[PDB]
Design a binder for this molecule. Sequence first.
Ligand SMILES: OC[C@H]1O[C@@H](O[C@H]2[C@H](O)[C@@H](O)[C@@H](O)O[C@@H]2CO)[C@H](O)[C@@H](O)[C@H]1O
Ligand SMILES: OC[C@H]1O[C@@H](O[C@H]2[C@H](O)[C@@H](O)[C@@H](O)O[C@@H]2CO)[C@H](O)[C@@H](O)[C@H]1O
Lengths: 135, 136
Amino acid sequence: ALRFEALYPEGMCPGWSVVVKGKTSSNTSMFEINFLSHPGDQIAFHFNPRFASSRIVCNSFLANHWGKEEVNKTFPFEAKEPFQVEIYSDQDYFHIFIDENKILQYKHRQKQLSSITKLQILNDIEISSVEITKR
Amino acid sequence: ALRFEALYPEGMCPGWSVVVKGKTSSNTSMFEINFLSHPGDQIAFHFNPRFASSRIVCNSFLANHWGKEEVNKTFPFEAKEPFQVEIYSDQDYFHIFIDENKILQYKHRQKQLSSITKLQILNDIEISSVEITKRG
Ligand SMILES: OC[C@H]1O[C@@H](O[C@H]2[C@H](O)[C@@H](O)[C@@H](O)O[C@@H]2CO)[C@H](O)[C@@H](O)[C@H]1O
Ligand SMILES: OC[C@H]1O[C@@H](O[C@H]2[C@H](O)[C@@H](O)[C@@H](O)O[C@@H]2CO)[C@H](O)[C@@H](O)[C@H]1O
Protein backbone atom coordinates (compact mmCIF):
# COMPACT_ATOMS: atom_id res chain seq x y z
CA ALA A 1 0.00 0.00 0.00
CA LEU A 2 0.99 3.66 0.23
CA ARG A 3 4.02 4.31 2.42
CA PHE A 4 4.70 8.01 1.83
CA GLU A 5 3.38 10.94 -0.16
CA ALA A 6 4.45 14.57 -0.47
CA LEU A 7 2.79 17.54 -2.13
CA TYR A 8 4.65 20.72 -3.11
CA PRO A 9 2.32 22.87 -5.21
CA GLU A 10 5.08 25.14 -6.57
CA GLY A 11 6.48 22.19 -8.57
CA MET A 12 9.31 19.82 -7.73
CA CYS A 13 10.61 19.76 -11.32
CA PRO A 14 13.03 20.87 -12.55
CA GLY A 15 15.81 21.20 -10.03
CA TRP A 16 14.62 19.32 -6.94
CA SER A 17 16.38 16.27 -5.52
CA VAL A 18 14.50 13.51 -3.67
CA VAL A 19 16.50 11.20 -1.40
CA VAL A 20 14.80 8.09 0.01
CA LYS A 21 16.45 5.73 2.49
CA GLY A 22 15.07 2.41 3.68
CA LYS A 23 15.11 -1.34 3.14
CA THR A 24 12.73 -3.99 1.89
CA SER A 25 10.74 -6.40 4.05
CA SER A 26 10.78 -9.45 1.76
CA ASN A 27 13.14 -10.76 -0.88
CA THR A 28 10.39 -11.39 -3.45
CA SER A 29 8.24 -8.25 -3.38
CA MET A 30 8.76 -4.81 -4.89
CA PHE A 31 8.23 -1.09 -4.37
CA GLU A 32 7.87 1.97 -6.57
CA ILE A 33 8.49 5.71 -6.56
CA ASN A 34 6.12 7.81 -8.69
CA PHE A 35 6.13 11.48 -9.68
CA LEU A 36 2.56 12.65 -10.38
CA SER A 37 1.37 15.67 -12.32
CA HIS A 38 -1.51 17.90 -11.20
CA PRO A 39 -4.39 17.49 -11.59
CA GLY A 40 -5.50 13.92 -12.13
CA ASP A 41 -2.32 12.15 -11.06
CA GLN A 42 -0.86 11.00 -14.32
CA ILE A 43 2.55 9.48 -13.55
CA ALA A 44 5.29 11.65 -15.02
CA PHE A 45 7.89 9.09 -13.90
CA HIS A 46 7.50 5.62 -12.35
CA PHE A 47 10.47 3.87 -10.65
CA ASN A 48 9.76 0.23 -9.72
CA PRO A 49 12.51 -2.06 -8.34
CA ARG A 50 11.34 -5.67 -8.64
CA PHE A 51 13.15 -7.99 -6.23
CA ALA A 52 11.50 -11.25 -7.32
CA SER A 53 13.12 -10.77 -10.74
CA SER A 54 15.95 -8.32 -9.87
CA ARG A 55 15.19 -5.66 -12.50
CA ILE A 56 14.17 -2.00 -12.39
CA VAL A 57 11.20 -0.98 -14.55
CA CYS A 58 10.88 2.72 -15.39
CA ASN A 59 7.88 4.11 -17.27
CA SER A 60 5.27 6.84 -17.48
CA PHE A 61 1.47 6.70 -17.29
CA LEU A 62 0.04 9.52 -19.36
CA ALA A 63 -3.53 9.69 -20.63
CA ASN A 64 -4.77 6.23 -19.60
CA HIS A 65 -1.90 3.90 -20.63
CA TRP A 66 1.67 3.04 -19.80
CA GLY A 67 4.30 3.85 -22.39
CA LYS A 68 7.39 1.92 -23.40
CA GLU A 69 9.16 0.30 -20.45
CA GLU A 70 12.75 1.31 -19.73
CA VAL A 71 14.48 -1.57 -17.95
CA ASN A 72 17.78 -1.93 -16.07
CA LYS A 73 18.99 -5.51 -15.54
CA THR A 74 21.79 -4.87 -13.04
CA PHE A 75 20.19 -4.69 -9.60
CA PRO A 76 22.12 -2.42 -7.19
CA PHE A 77 19.65 -3.44 -4.45
CA GLU A 78 19.67 -6.32 -2.00
CA ALA A 79 16.71 -7.57 0.03
CA LYS A 80 16.60 -6.46 3.68
CA GLU A 81 19.76 -4.35 3.29
CA PRO A 82 19.54 -0.57 3.77
CA PHE A 83 19.79 1.43 0.56
CA GLN A 84 19.72 5.04 -0.61
CA VAL A 85 17.95 6.23 -3.77
CA GLU A 86 18.35 9.76 -5.10
CA ILE A 87 16.06 10.96 -7.89
CA TYR A 88 16.87 14.38 -9.34
CA SER A 89 15.63 16.15 -12.43
CA ASP A 90 16.81 18.87 -14.83
CA GLN A 91 15.27 20.37 -17.98
CA ASP A 92 15.80 17.16 -19.97
CA TYR A 93 15.98 14.03 -17.77
CA PHE A 94 15.23 12.43 -14.45
CA HIS A 95 18.52 11.26 -12.87
CA ILE A 96 18.78 8.16 -10.69
CA PHE A 97 21.44 7.29 -8.08
CA ILE A 98 21.55 4.20 -5.87
CA ASP A 99 23.92 4.05 -2.90
CA GLU A 100 25.56 7.15 -4.42
CA ASN A 101 26.20 5.49 -7.81
CA LYS A 102 24.45 6.79 -10.91
CA ILE A 103 22.36 3.94 -12.32
CA LEU A 104 20.24 5.53 -15.05
CA GLN A 105 18.67 8.61 -16.55
CA TYR A 106 15.16 8.86 -18.01
CA LYS A 107 14.24 11.50 -20.57
CA HIS A 108 11.15 13.58 -19.87
CA ARG A 109 7.94 12.38 -21.49
CA GLN A 110 5.63 14.69 -19.54
CA LYS A 111 6.88 18.02 -20.83
CA GLN A 112 4.91 20.17 -18.32
CA LEU A 113 7.56 20.07 -15.61
CA SER A 114 5.94 22.60 -13.26
CA SER A 115 2.81 20.42 -13.09
CA ILE A 116 4.78 17.70 -11.28
CA THR A 117 3.73 18.50 -7.70
CA LYS A 118 3.36 15.08 -6.05
CA LEU A 119 5.59 12.26 -4.86
CA GLN A 120 4.35 8.87 -3.65
CA ILE A 121 6.06 5.69 -2.43
CA LEU A 122 4.20 2.37 -2.53
CA ASN A 123 4.43 -1.24 -1.31
CA ASP A 124 7.47 -3.11 0.01
CA ILE A 125 9.77 -0.46 1.41
CA GLU A 126 10.46 0.40 5.03
CA ILE A 127 11.26 4.11 4.96
CA SER A 128 13.92 5.56 7.25
CA SER A 129 14.25 9.00 5.63
CA VAL A 130 12.89 11.07 2.75
CA GLU A 131 14.70 14.28 1.94
CA ILE A 132 13.53 16.80 -0.64
CA THR A 133 15.90 19.63 -1.48
CA LYS A 134 16.11 22.33 -4.14
CA ARG A 135 19.29 22.22 -6.25
CA ALA B 1 -1.55 28.89 1.22
CA LEU B 2 -0.30 25.30 1.53
CA ARG B 3 3.41 25.34 0.77
CA PHE B 4 4.13 21.66 1.49
CA GLU B 5 2.41 18.58 2.91
CA ALA B 6 3.65 15.03 3.58
CA LEU B 7 1.89 11.87 4.74
CA TYR B 8 3.35 8.75 6.34
CA PRO B 9 0.43 6.48 7.26
CA GLU B 10 2.55 4.35 9.58
CA GLY B 11 2.78 7.37 11.92
CA MET B 12 5.70 9.79 12.14
CA CYS B 13 5.63 10.12 15.93
CA PRO B 14 7.38 9.57 18.18
CA GLY B 15 11.03 9.26 17.24
CA TRP B 16 11.08 11.18 13.96
CA SER B 17 12.94 14.36 13.06
CA VAL B 18 11.48 16.93 10.65
CA VAL B 19 13.90 19.55 9.35
CA VAL B 20 12.58 22.49 7.37
CA LYS B 21 14.80 25.08 5.69
CA GLY B 22 13.74 28.26 3.98
CA LYS B 23 13.08 31.93 4.55
CA THR B 24 10.16 34.31 4.73
CA SER B 25 9.44 37.51 2.78
CA SER B 26 7.88 40.13 5.07
CA ASN B 27 8.93 41.48 8.44
CA THR B 28 5.19 41.27 9.27
CA SER B 29 4.15 37.86 7.89
CA MET B 30 3.93 34.45 9.54
CA PHE B 31 4.12 30.77 8.67
CA GLU B 32 3.03 27.57 10.36
CA ILE B 33 4.23 23.99 10.68
CA ASN B 34 1.41 21.62 11.69
CA PHE B 35 1.44 17.96 12.68
CA LEU B 36 -1.99 16.40 12.01
CA SER B 37 -3.60 13.21 13.29
CA HIS B 38 -6.47 11.05 11.98
CA PRO B 39 -9.39 10.84 12.18
CA GLY B 40 -10.51 14.42 11.61
CA ASP B 41 -7.33 16.20 10.50
CA GLN B 42 -6.78 17.31 14.09
CA ILE B 43 -3.69 19.43 14.70
CA ALA B 44 -1.66 17.74 17.44
CA PHE B 45 1.12 20.33 17.13
CA HIS B 46 0.88 23.82 15.61
CA PHE B 47 4.12 25.85 15.38
CA ASN B 48 3.35 29.45 14.34
CA PRO B 49 6.11 32.12 14.24
CA ARG B 50 4.49 35.56 13.93
CA PHE B 51 7.03 38.10 12.68
CA ALA B 52 4.84 41.20 13.11
CA SER B 53 5.10 40.60 16.88
CA SER B 54 8.31 38.56 17.15
CA ARG B 55 6.72 35.71 19.04
CA ILE B 56 6.27 31.99 18.34
CA VAL B 57 2.78 30.69 19.11
CA CYS B 58 2.28 26.94 19.66
CA ASN B 59 -1.03 25.17 20.39
CA SER B 60 -3.25 22.24 19.36
CA PHE B 61 -6.50 22.16 17.35
CA LEU B 62 -8.22 19.17 18.92
CA ALA B 63 -11.93 18.34 18.64
CA ASN B 64 -12.30 21.50 16.53
CA HIS B 65 -11.11 23.93 19.24
CA TRP B 66 -7.82 25.74 19.74
CA GLY B 67 -6.27 25.01 23.13
CA LYS B 68 -4.25 27.14 25.50
CA GLU B 69 -1.50 29.03 23.68
CA GLU B 70 2.14 28.33 24.59
CA VAL B 71 3.97 31.51 23.56
CA ASN B 72 7.74 31.59 23.36
CA LYS B 73 9.74 34.61 24.50
CA THR B 74 12.82 34.48 22.29
CA PHE B 75 12.33 34.91 18.55
CA PRO B 76 15.36 33.69 16.57
CA PHE B 77 14.09 34.44 13.08
CA GLU B 78 14.97 37.50 11.00
CA ALA B 79 12.75 38.28 8.02
CA LYS B 80 14.29 37.66 4.59
CA GLU B 81 17.10 35.60 6.21
CA PRO B 82 17.49 31.83 5.73
CA PHE B 83 16.74 29.68 8.77
CA GLN B 84 16.49 26.04 9.81
CA VAL B 85 13.74 24.62 12.02
CA GLU B 86 14.02 21.08 13.38
CA ILE B 87 11.11 19.45 15.22
CA TYR B 88 11.82 16.16 17.00
CA SER B 89 9.38 14.03 18.97
CA ASP B 90 9.91 11.73 21.91
CA GLN B 91 7.32 9.91 24.00
CA ASP B 92 6.71 13.17 25.97
CA TYR B 93 7.52 16.31 23.95
CA PHE B 94 7.81 17.91 20.60
CA HIS B 95 11.33 19.41 20.82
CA ILE B 96 12.07 22.49 18.69
CA PHE B 97 15.55 23.51 17.53
CA ILE B 98 16.01 26.65 15.44
CA ASP B 99 19.36 27.03 13.68
CA GLU B 100 20.56 24.06 15.74
CA ASN B 101 19.74 25.83 19.04
CA LYS B 102 17.08 24.23 21.23
CA ILE B 103 14.30 26.73 21.87
CA LEU B 104 11.24 25.05 23.30
CA GLN B 105 9.56 21.77 24.17
CA TYR B 106 5.83 21.15 23.85
CA LYS B 107 4.03 18.50 25.89
CA HIS B 108 1.97 16.08 23.81
CA ARG B 109 -1.73 16.80 24.15
CA GLN B 110 -2.71 14.35 21.43
CA LYS B 111 -1.75 11.19 23.29
CA GLN B 112 -2.19 8.74 20.35
CA LEU B 113 1.19 9.40 18.77
CA SER B 114 0.88 6.57 16.23
CA SER B 115 -2.05 8.44 14.65
CA ILE B 116 0.07 11.54 13.82
CA THR B 117 0.66 10.88 10.12
CA LYS B 118 0.68 14.25 8.36
CA LEU B 119 2.96 17.29 8.25
CA GLN B 120 1.78 20.63 6.87
CA ILE B 121 3.63 23.83 5.99
CA LEU B 122 1.57 26.97 5.32
CA ASN B 123 1.88 30.62 4.34
CA ASP B 124 4.92 32.89 4.21
CA ILE B 125 7.84 30.48 3.97
CA GLU B 126 9.90 29.83 0.81
CA ILE B 127 10.99 26.24 1.29
CA SER B 128 14.44 25.19 0.13
CA SER B 129 14.39 21.78 1.78
CA VAL B 130 12.30 19.40 3.87
CA GLU B 131 13.80 16.32 5.47
CA ILE B 132 11.83 13.66 7.34
CA THR B 133 14.06 11.15 9.13
CA LYS B 134 13.46 8.43 11.70
CA ARG B 135 15.09 9.12 15.08
CA GLY B 136 17.42 11.92 13.92
O1 LIG C 1 5.61 -0.38 -17.04
C1 LIG C 1 5.43 -0.31 -15.63
C2 LIG C 1 4.19 -1.09 -15.29
O2 LIG C 1 4.40 -2.48 -15.65
C3 LIG C 1 3.24 -3.33 -15.32
O3 LIG C 1 3.48 -4.68 -15.63
C4 LIG C 1 3.72 -4.88 -17.05
C5 LIG C 1 4.97 -5.71 -17.20
O4 LIG C 1 6.13 -4.88 -16.83
C6 LIG C 1 5.20 -6.25 -18.55
O5 LIG C 1 6.25 -7.24 -18.51
C7 LIG C 1 3.96 -6.92 -19.09
O6 LIG C 1 3.66 -8.00 -18.28
O7 LIG C 1 2.81 -6.00 -19.08
C8 LIG C 1 2.52 -5.54 -17.72
C9 LIG C 1 1.34 -4.59 -17.83
O8 LIG C 1 1.61 -3.61 -18.81
C10 LIG C 1 2.89 -3.19 -13.84
O9 LIG C 1 1.71 -3.94 -13.56
C11 LIG C 1 2.70 -1.77 -13.43
O10 LIG C 1 2.50 -1.71 -11.98
C12 LIG C 1 3.88 -0.95 -13.80
O11 LIG C 1 5.00 -1.37 -13.05
O1 LIG D 1 -3.53 29.72 19.12
C1 LIG D 1 -3.13 29.45 17.78
C2 LIG D 1 -4.19 30.03 16.87
O2 LIG D 1 -4.29 31.44 17.15
C3 LIG D 1 -5.28 32.11 16.31
O3 LIG D 1 -5.32 33.48 16.59
C4 LIG D 1 -5.76 33.76 17.95
C5 LIG D 1 -4.82 34.78 18.54
O4 LIG D 1 -3.59 34.06 18.81
C6 LIG D 1 -5.25 35.44 19.80
O5 LIG D 1 -4.62 36.75 19.91
C7 LIG D 1 -6.74 35.66 19.95
O6 LIG D 1 -7.07 36.84 19.32
O7 LIG D 1 -7.57 34.58 19.36
C8 LIG D 1 -7.19 34.26 17.99
C9 LIG D 1 -8.18 33.21 17.51
O8 LIG D 1 -8.11 32.07 18.37
C10 LIG D 1 -4.93 31.90 14.84
O9 LIG D 1 -5.96 32.46 14.02
C11 LIG D 1 -4.76 30.47 14.51
O10 LIG D 1 -4.23 30.39 13.15
C12 LIG D 1 -3.82 29.80 15.41
O11 LIG D 1 -2.53 30.34 15.21
